[PDB]
Nucleic acid binder design. Structure first.
Length: 86
DNA sequence: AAACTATGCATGCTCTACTGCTTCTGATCTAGTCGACT
């Protein structure tokens, strides 16, 4: 559960385990030891938990192409990662 | 002629500014360690 939080790794999860935080609520109880990455991950935990579908991938690519063109014309963007693997 | 008073001056003391030199302190750049991510 802890590892699914953006900005929280194995070491941080183990540290929280040894500190007595056994559920997600305790993390939100004290939002002062969480860095920017952890705060962002916890704020939108539910949205990022849902798997990303191909439709979102195509929408993101279409949006990013316009930004890349505006920054500069003639640039190319390629989709890599798991999606490129099918 | 003698006693009292007057001015006059000097030197040490005190303060406030002024300038220049020396030392201390606060702001700004990187190595290492832990952690995050792809």
């Amino acid at each position: 559960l802890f590892t699914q939080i953006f900005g929280v790794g194995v070491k941080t999860a183990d540290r929280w385990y040894r500190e007595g935080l056994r559920t997600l609520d305790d993390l939100r109880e004290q939002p002062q030891k969480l860095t920017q990455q952890q705060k962002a991950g916890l704020q939108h935990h539910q949205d990022l938990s849902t798997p990303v579908l191909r439709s979102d991938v195509d929408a993101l690519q279409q949006v990013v192409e316009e930004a890349v063109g505006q920054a500069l014309p003639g640039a190319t963007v390629t989709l890599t990662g798991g999606f490129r693997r099918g």
